[PDB]
Symmetry: C5
Subunit: 311 residues, 5 copies
């Protein structure tokens, strides 16, 4: 067993195809996802060709070890895929049709900039390293690229599974490498974030603003501080579900901005009390009266600015 | 070793049967469950048929590698099942009786809409890809589908383990695929949710309503804010045990609605104090007096509406 | 390699023995435990008979694949046991003495009703399915059932490791199955629960009762609410360490009952303040005075009732 | 392949040696540690002996399967070690020199009594079961017992890696077993516990004692209750990092004792207020004044007593 | 298969090269990282040499088992690497060119002193043990040491992947061991720590200092205690993400220092109230007025001192 030789001096074309059976475990923190799919391989090996009329058989079967099979590997995997050879069929002209069922944990980075309203493009990079006797080149058989209807990825919507038809051929350690890009397009199901994180977070912030309709320093301190602690809880909960990004995310920005509002509300609450003690409740009253309008307006304005910058 | 050829031009019928030995690890967040069961396979291979007379044995035992065995796979599995061939028996007419003991992590989505009062239908999809020489079709031998009496799935009740007798035959990459649906019907044991999450959650909310029988703003702010923090704790605890659904769940709805009650109670508490400071305790008194009846009534009404919409 | 044949028409007796080397990872939530032990098997295969004269050796040593070995499996395991064949010895008569060292994660349900003062009976079910040529029956060789003295299972006391001598023989999918029950009796080391969960929990509850010697509504609200939050913390901590049971557990009952005490204390605290504001401190004083006695008495009575019902 | 026969009737001496390459993952809760080391084995097999002069080769190398190798196993392991045979060398006299590189998860109990100022002795028990033809006995070749200089075990100091030279020979299931004890002496790096758990815990307790210089019941209730909640947090954090011991640990004792101080401080705070309301501030003043001295003195005394009892 | 013999009496040089394909899972607590890379090996084996003319081939391909391949192992790995032989090529002079693709979990300690502004040098130690017939020495072929452009390690910046050309040759258990050091230089992406941990932590501290512009003991106690609890939360969050170091880290120092500020602020708050009750508000006023300047100044000074000592 060694590579099929060239008729002229052409490279060996191995036609590929990935058909997704299962999608699961998209881990945001790890930036990984699990896949269960069919891997299809097709190439011509003339040494295997036969007569259809004389052989009586139109197709011949082979056990993996019996024939030369190209070493196709995945670039972005944690460990080498778990493969089960489903079938090897050889047609009269020496065209081989290989099929395996595999499962792998794919490493594909995610862009957290618009979280939880983000969309992603997951990648599966197929690769083949050229042998000394000949160069191996990959290609996409669009007929054998797909996914089953039931393929569901929890908390995400599956847009498309396509392959970039033109392989990226390059030199690596003094030998040719032919690389293919299979792309899984998904978009996050943001629904649940609204009643679980967004609205609770806004409610606790609005509750803090009731201190603008109270002259009790002791009650205000409780209002602002308490809600600030609940905000820290939400911040912590949110940051545990996400990886540490070198860029600012949409959620990150909002969560951060909100801290400034709690800080300024504390200052206001302190100022109001200070003036009151200092026997000037009229300045204190106008500062509070302003804040009543200022706080929601600046909050609403700031959010528009951020949504603009982010979307 | 290659498929048994057709007498006429009929497809090969493989008679299946799953007998559950163990059920465990139903992970709600992951929407997976672990299973340990017997897989039974039966098909006719005439090339193996014999005369009971001349041979002097009414059965024939084989090692897996010695005979042709159909490639039965599970659709909804994380990784290929762990199988141990228990026995392979051949009857005089060439009827093969295959038995294996397997364990697998099955991916089956759950409908969280009625959580924790929900019921589920877990699936085990058996599949067979047809060969070039012939088409393979699956069938259910009802005699070999079951579960042992001891099969317990922690915090769930096992209703039934049945199989949809008629397979779903379809084309996949120009070959025939025959798919069978084994269904495990279960219903959640909601008991524990009552004293652990439900009642504590209601108690903390009722405690918040004592602020309707108090004129102390400072005590009221403490009552409502404190309990709101305890509610956030319960919300967080609940949401960590569940996956992110694109739909509203029953518990989700309740938890969410309750936030509105805390928000409105804060408003009431603020209003009462504001009026009192503004030297009009009679308006404040009537608002408070109404709230004492309004809050429980609207809570009880809202819950009826929700239970109705959900069940 | 196929079963040894009967002299008369007797079933094959495979003697068994489990000798525990290691016990670890008793997971309460999962209701699983890990075991590392010796599995001993002994059956007569006359086909292996030999003359020590003609063969030199008094006992013959065989490699697993060389001889017929009965397929012994465990019923209540997650996955097939990790086995290492330690020795296979055949005496001249053909008596086979098989020894393997295995490790497995055993699934055995637990009765949480008396937690953390509960005792358990863990099971290891050995099984053998009968072949077509002959019936296989299991037996216990009491001489080969044990555990080493060092066998420690963290936070549990090991009472006994015994086997139910009489196997449970039954039909399963048209063949005989011989099942054996090995029983590991253990009892929980409740010590640590006293200073870690019990006493802290009682202290925080007693602290709440100081509100019965205070006329300050604002301090009382803080006392009762604060401690209630600390109780929720303990409840959550406790419930994370346990699986969701369809029955009430001893700890569960106590934790639940305590909520009622916090609820009633809030009511009392509210009533006392209401009456005081309403210019009737004498009724308030007598209600408080009774509560000081009522609360500890009813708590102590309720606990006796519960301990009675549970033990 | 079968055991080398005795010259006289002596047992087979297997010389052992463990050389630690990597030490990691000391899990306190699980009472396990991971090891990566060389396992050296040496015995005499006269059947393999040769002429030094006539052969012209000083030593001869073999493949595992070619020769008889004793079955050395570890007693206290989770699962059977991952071994790679590095080399097998036979000298002229028939002395076999075996070397393998292994990795295993060792189960070794820990004494938490002096945590986090404790020291431990981790064990690796080598074992060999005697064959029918002859008895196998283990020995330590001190020349081949060691560890590399870089061997670091995070948050622990490695004192020594030694072996108890005299094996423990005993009967187990009617055959001789020769057991060796390799001991890894380590001591915990307590440094970090000081600024992370100890000092914060003491600071929150001291903060609680400021209530002895305050006449405000409402502020005191806040001071004592708040800090008590922070103490519960530390207790919980500490207990999550440790297994449930049937004995009292040093930290456990301290954490527990501190609860009593919070309880008594609440009593004091209640008493002071009660007396003040009851128009007797002079008794209240002297009780508070005493507490100011009593609390730190009894704390300091109690700690000395405990440190004494524990070290 | 045995080592290629020396022409003179030279040691065998094995040229090495590591080309990183993937980098992931840098676990700070565990001090481990996962790698996926190509391992290249090249040595001269004269026994494999051939005349290009009588062969009609420029190269010769071999299956691992067919030829002698040196046993290269990694020193700092958890378990033996997962390797797939990609290719084995032999040039006419008997120069062997070996290529494998591997994945391993590398144990490499980290210096937490400047966290989260730290940089690290991860190591991959290649090792070879010398055989009896001859000594094996490792060498770096700089042409075959690299990483692909896509190599990303989440939350870290990859500076360089280089190899220390000169191997460290030494004796280990009477055999010569040749060790090579491959170094991955990385630096932490500190960005996210600023809005997630740093700024929130500073804000809660500044909020505590508003008590210097308040005469209300009850509000102050709330301000300082509340924020202290939020600080404990951040401390706990930070310490869970890091391993226990025997040295003080930069973050560790800051977190610790901040506790002292909370403690002193409580003292101030206590003193101010004490004096006020004791009818001397002028001393109290000047102490408070000083603190307003003292606290930020000493905080700013302390930080400069620390940043100096650490960077
Ligand atoms: C918010 C927001 O700003 O949300 C924006 C997103 C839509 O963003 P997108 O679908 O990625 O559009 C990407 C294309 N262009 C021009 C933006 C680039 O959310 C939604 O549709 C629903 C909003 C949820 C409402 C929040 C309730 C409180
Ligand atoms: C609540 C609820 O509304 O609970 C409803 C469920 C029963 O719902 P089901 O068995 O799925 O009925 C499904 C069939 N039809 C018409 C509804 C579709 O809970 C129970 O029986 C027990 C109620 C627990 C009491 C809560 C105590 C506070
Ligand atoms: C409590 C309790 O009620 O605890 C009962 C258990 C003993 O229960 P048992 O050993 O299972 O007896 C089972 C047999 N009969 C009749 C009960 C069935 O705890 C103890 O011995 C120690 C009590 C811990 C003290 C709690 C301190 C606060
Ligand atoms: C405390 C303690 O009591 O700590 C004692 C240990 C030393 O204990 P050891 O090294 O095990 O001595 C074992 C031998 N004999 C007689 C004790 C048996 O801590 C230290 O050296 C450092 C003390 C940390 C200071 C705590 C700061 C607050
Ligand atoms: C802080 C600090 O002190 O941060 C110092 C580091 C730079 O330290 P370095 O790159 O390792 O310099 C190592 C070389 N010499 C002389 C220092 C040894 O952070 C930064 O550049 C950005 C600072 C973040 C701002 C914090 C905002 C609040
Ligand atoms: C697997 C990981 C699991 C991680 C689990 C993490 C759990 C987090 C614990 C949350 C801490 C709650 O924080 C707590 O909330 C209440 C809100 O009523 C605050 O308290 C506020 O009102 C109370 C009650 O009147 C006062 O005692 C208090 O002084 C005041 O500041 C407490 O001061 C605060 O300490
Ligand atoms: C969590 C984060 C994404 C967020 C929080 C609160 C409010 C908003 C907008 C939609 C107003 C928001 O986008
Ligand atoms: C958790 C959620 C399911 C829930 C909480 C509180 C009350 C109710 C009804 C039964 C009143 C409820 O269904
Ligand atoms: C945790 C639970 C088991 C419990 C809590 C508090 C008190 C008691 C009895 C022993 C009084 C108790 O059994
Ligand atoms: C955590 C536990 C070990 C502890 C806490 C606080 C104080 C001390 C002594 C050293 C005073 C202590 O040993
Ligand atoms: C977390 C720790 C690294 C830290 C916290 C707060 C402030 C600072 C400096 C940059 C002022 C800091 O370095």
């Amino acid at each position: 067993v060694s590579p099929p030789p060239p008729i002229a001096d052409e490279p060996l074309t191995v036609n590929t195809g990935i058909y997704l059976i299962e999608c699961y475990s998209l881990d945001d923190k790890a930036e990984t996802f699990k896949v269960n799919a069919f891997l299809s391989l097709s190439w011509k090996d003339r040494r295997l060709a036969f007569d259809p009329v004389r052989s009586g058989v139109r197709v011949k079967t082979y056990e993996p070890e019996a024939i030369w099979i190209p070493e196709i590997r995945f670039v972005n995997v944690e460990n080498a895929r778990d493969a089960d050879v489903v079938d090897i069929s050889v047609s009269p002209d020496g065209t081989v049709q290989y099929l395996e069922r595999f499962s792998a944990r794919v490493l594909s980075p995610l862009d957290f900039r618009r979280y939880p309203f983000d969309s992603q493009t997951l990648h599966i990079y197929l690769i083949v390293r050229s042998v000394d006797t000949r160069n191996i080149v990959l290609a996409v058989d669009l007929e054998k690229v797909g996914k089953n209807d039931d393929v569901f990825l929890t908390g995400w919507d599956i847009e498309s599974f396509t392959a970039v038809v033109k392989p990226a051929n390059f030199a690596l350690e003094d030998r040719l490498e032919s690389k293919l890009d299979y792309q899984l397009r998904i978009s996050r199901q943001y629904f649940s974030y609204i009643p679980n994180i967004i609205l609770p977070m806004l409610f606790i912030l609005f509750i803090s603003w009731t201190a603008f309709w109270s002259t009790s320093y002791e009650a205000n301190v409780t209002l602002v501080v308490s809600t600030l602690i609940a905000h820290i809880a939400f911040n912590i909960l949110v940051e545990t579900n996400l990886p540490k990004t070198p860029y600012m995310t949409y959620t990150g920005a909002i969560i951060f901005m909100i801290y400034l509002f709690y800080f300024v509300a504390v200052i206001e609450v302190t100022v109001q009390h200070y003036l009151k003690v200092e026997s000037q409740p009229a300045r204190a009253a106008s500062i509070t009266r302003a804040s009543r309008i200022a706080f929601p307006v600046v909050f609403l304005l700031a959010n528009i600015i951020l949504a603009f910058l982010f979307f």
